[PDB]
PDB file of C-alpha atoms in Angstrom:
ATOM      1  CA  UNK D  11    -151.454  26.682   1.886  1.00 36.48           C
ATOM      2  CA  UNK D  12    -151.778  27.683   5.529  1.00 36.97           C
ATOM      3  CA  UNK D  13    -151.794  25.563   8.652  1.00 38.75           C
ATOM      4  CA  UNK D  14    -155.023  23.645   9.119  1.00 40.00           C
ATOM      5  CA  UNK D  15    -154.341  22.725  12.740  1.00 40.29           C
ATOM      6  CA  UNK D  16    -153.799  18.999  12.105  1.00 39.79           C
ATOM      7  CA  UNK D  17    -150.767  16.882  11.370  1.00 37.58           C
ATOM      8  CA  UNK D  18    -150.441  13.245  10.368  1.00 36.40           C
ATOM      9  CA  UNK D  19    -147.883  11.198  12.269  1.00 35.32           C
ATOM     10  CA  UNK D  20    -146.707   7.956  10.622  1.00 30.64           C
ATOM     11  CA  UNK D  21    -147.004   5.089  13.082  1.00 28.89           C
ATOM     12  CA  UNK D  22    -143.877   3.442  11.631  1.00 29.96           C
ATOM     13  CA  UNK D  23    -141.918   6.606  12.425  1.00 27.10           C
ATOM     14  CA  UNK D  24    -140.808   9.549  10.335  1.00 29.53           C
ATOM     15  CA  UNK D  25    -141.670  13.163   9.606  1.00 29.89           C
ATOM     16  CA  UNK D  26    -145.128  14.479  10.384  1.00 31.88           C
ATOM     17  CA  UNK D  27    -147.195  15.795   7.468  1.00 34.05           C
ATOM     18  CA  UNK D  28    -149.157  19.006   7.954  1.00 33.95           C
ATOM     19  CA  UNK D  29    -152.603  19.492   6.471  1.00 33.50           C
ATOM     20  CA  UNK D  30    -154.054  22.725   5.087  1.00 35.63           C
ATOM     21  CA  UNK D  31    -157.693  23.806   5.440  1.00 34.42           C
ATOM     22  CA  UNK D  32    -160.138  22.290   2.979  1.00 33.46           C
ATOM     23  CA  UNK D  33    -159.880  19.083   1.014  1.00 32.48           C
ATOM     24  CA  UNK D  34    -156.623  17.221   0.383  1.00 29.90           C
ATOM     25  CA  UNK D  35    -156.522  14.106  -1.828  1.00 27.24           C
ATOM     26  CA  UNK D  36    -154.303  11.428  -0.329  1.00 27.37           C
ATOM     27  CA  UNK D  37    -152.866   8.220  -1.709  1.00 30.62           C
ATOM     28  CA  UNK D  38    -149.638   7.497  -3.471  1.00 31.79           C
ATOM     29  CA  UNK D  39    -147.490  10.469  -4.322  1.00 29.91           C
ATOM     30  CA  UNK D  40    -145.083  12.956  -2.772  1.00 25.63           C
ATOM     31  CA  UNK D  41    -147.366  14.325  -0.028  1.00 27.02           C
ATOM     32  CA  UNK D  42    -147.091  11.193   2.113  1.00 28.25           C
ATOM     33  CA  UNK D  43    -144.078   9.756   0.292  1.00 30.14           C
ATOM     34  CA  UNK D  44    -145.885   6.645  -0.885  1.00 31.26           C
ATOM     35  CA  UNK D  45    -144.831   4.850  -4.073  1.00 31.86           C
ATOM     36  CA  UNK D  46    -146.859   1.646  -4.079  1.00 33.17           C
ATOM     37  CA  UNK D  47    -149.116   0.016  -6.641  1.00 32.11           C
ATOM     38  CA  UNK D  48    -151.455  -1.047  -3.809  1.00 33.34           C
ATOM     39  CA  UNK D  49    -152.412   2.562  -3.036  1.00 31.42           C
ATOM     40  CA  UNK D  50    -154.341   4.686  -5.513  1.00 32.23           C
ATOM     41  CA  UNK D  51    -153.333   8.219  -6.374  1.00 33.90           C
ATOM     42  CA  UNK D  52    -156.947   9.010  -5.399  1.00 34.18           C
ATOM     43  CA  UNK D  53    -157.297   6.791  -2.346  1.00 33.77           C
ATOM     44  CA  UNK D  54    -159.110   9.105   0.062  1.00 31.23           C
ATOM     45  CA  UNK D  55    -160.043  12.741   0.693  1.00 31.53           C
ATOM     46  CA  UNK D  56    -159.131  14.421   3.963  1.00 30.00           C
ATOM     47  CA  UNK D  57    -161.024  17.586   4.846  1.00 28.08           C
ATOM     48  CA  UNK D  58    -160.120  20.143   7.500  1.00 28.92           C
ATOM     49  CA  UNK D  59    -163.031  22.437   8.371  1.00 27.73           C
ATOM     50  CA  UNK D  60    -164.473  23.986  11.492  1.00 28.05           C
ATOM     51  CA  UNK D  61    -161.837  22.554  13.791  1.00 25.43           C
ATOM     52  CA  UNK D  62    -162.387  18.978  12.611  1.00 23.95           C
ATOM     53  CA  UNK D  63    -160.753  16.479  10.293  1.00 22.83           C
ATOM     54  CA  UNK D  64    -162.747  13.880   8.347  1.00 23.41           C
ATOM     55  CA  UNK D  65    -161.791  11.210   5.811  1.00 24.39           C
ATOM     56  CA  UNK D  66    -163.800   9.879   2.865  1.00 28.09           C
ATOM     57  CA  UNK D  67    -162.502   6.648   1.248  1.00 27.20           C
ATOM     58  CA  UNK D  68    -162.876   7.082  -2.523  1.00 27.62           C
ATOM     59  CA  UNK D  69    -161.239   3.969  -4.031  1.00 27.79           C
ATOM     60  CA  UNK D  70    -162.039   0.279  -4.245  1.00 26.18           C
ATOM     61  CA  UNK D  71    -159.088  -0.390  -1.934  1.00 26.84           C
ATOM     62  CA  UNK D  72    -160.389   0.570   1.523  1.00 26.71           C
ATOM     63  CA  UNK D  73    -159.226   2.885   4.239  1.00 27.35           C
ATOM     64  CA  UNK D  74    -159.042   1.804   7.864  1.00 29.91           C
ATOM     65  CA  UNK D  75    -159.831   3.543  11.139  1.00 31.85           C
ATOM     66  CA  UNK D  76    -158.785   2.996  14.766  1.00 31.29           C
ATOM     67  CA  UNK D  77    -160.329   5.096  17.524  1.00 33.26           C
ATOM     68  CA  UNK D  78    -157.767   6.352  20.011  1.00 33.54           C
ATOM     69  CA  UNK D  79    -158.998   4.086  22.837  1.00 30.41           C
ATOM     70  CA  UNK D  80    -159.321   0.933  20.722  1.00 31.08           C
ATOM     71  CA  UNK D  81    -156.727  -1.499  19.408  1.00 29.62           C
ATOM     72  CA  UNK D  82    -157.806  -2.585  15.889  1.00 30.02           C
ATOM     73  CA  UNK D  83    -157.806  -0.932  12.466  1.00 30.09           C
ATOM     74  CA  UNK D  84    -161.325  -1.467  11.006  1.00 28.40           C
ATOM     75  CA  UNK D  85    -162.131  -0.980   7.296  1.00 30.28           C
ATOM     76  CA  UNK D  86    -164.323   2.049   6.731  1.00 30.23           C
ATOM     77  CA  UNK D  87    -167.590   2.017   4.802  1.00 28.73           C
ATOM     78  CA  UNK D  88    -166.716   3.326   1.302  1.00 33.14           C
ATOM     79  CA  UNK D  89    -167.456   6.829   0.044  1.00 34.04           C
ATOM     80  CA  UNK D  90    -168.785   8.148   3.363  1.00 31.78           C
ATOM     81  CA  UNK D  91    -167.082  10.569   5.726  1.00 35.09           C
ATOM     82  CA  UNK D  92    -165.656   9.534   9.089  1.00 35.57           C
ATOM     83  CA  UNK D  93    -164.413  12.059  11.640  1.00 35.20           C
ATOM     84  CA  UNK D  94    -160.865  11.579  12.908  1.00 39.21           C
ATOM     85  CA  UNK D  95    -160.407  12.954  16.395  1.00 38.22           C
ATOM     86  CA  UNK D  96    -156.945  13.817  17.700  1.00 37.44           C
ATOM     87  CA  UNK D  97    -155.309  10.590  18.815  1.00 37.05           C
ATOM     88  CA  UNK D  98    -157.265   8.429  16.370  1.00 35.96           C
ATOM     89  CA  UNK D  99    -155.470   6.624  13.539  1.00 34.83           C
ATOM     90  CA  UNK D 100    -156.326   5.820   9.948  1.00 33.90           C
ATOM     91  CA  UNK D 101    -154.454   3.819   7.343  1.00 32.27           C
ATOM     92  CA  UNK D 102    -154.307   3.295   3.611  1.00 31.03           C
ATOM     93  CA  UNK D 103    -153.464  -0.428   3.846  1.00 29.38           C
ATOM     94  CA  UNK D 104    -154.564  -2.741   6.629  1.00 29.01           C
ATOM     95  CA  UNK D 105    -151.094  -2.888   8.204  1.00 27.64           C
ATOM     96  CA  UNK D 106    -149.073  -0.168   6.444  1.00 29.32           C
ATOM     97  CA  UNK D 107    -149.278   3.586   5.865  1.00 26.66           C
ATOM     98  CA  UNK D 108    -150.907   4.160   9.268  1.00 24.14           C
ATOM     99  CA  UNK D 109    -151.137   7.707  10.648  1.00 21.72           C
ATOM    100  CA  UNK D 110    -152.102   9.143  14.016  1.00 23.37           C
ATOM    101  CA  UNK D 111    -153.932  12.474  14.041  1.00 24.02           C
ATOM    102  CA  UNK D 112    -152.351  15.265  16.052  1.00 25.68           C
ATOM    103  CA  UNK D 113    -153.886  18.678  16.738  1.00 25.51           C
ATOM    104  CA  UNK D 114    -151.536  21.671  16.457  1.00 25.27           C
ATOM    105  CA  UNK D 115    -151.893  25.445  16.353  1.00 24.08           C
TER     106      UNK D 115
END
């Protein structure tokens, strides 16, 4: 699909992953390059719409969020959306598969 204006930057280093407009299911699989029994194939939904990115955790294993100014990944309340502003981070495990949000054209 087309550019959605956001990219995910792995905090451990490596290629950025571009997001398209609309909903993208994330978890294990080729999109993020994750092969790991600890991460569901249906771990979270990212949605790009109206110039914003939000995440909804959809599995029993949580997602985590760190606002750009803060220092700690916090587990998100399940099955509710959280906006991810550019510079914020989220992760699929508490200390692994962490991504910073970047805004692009």
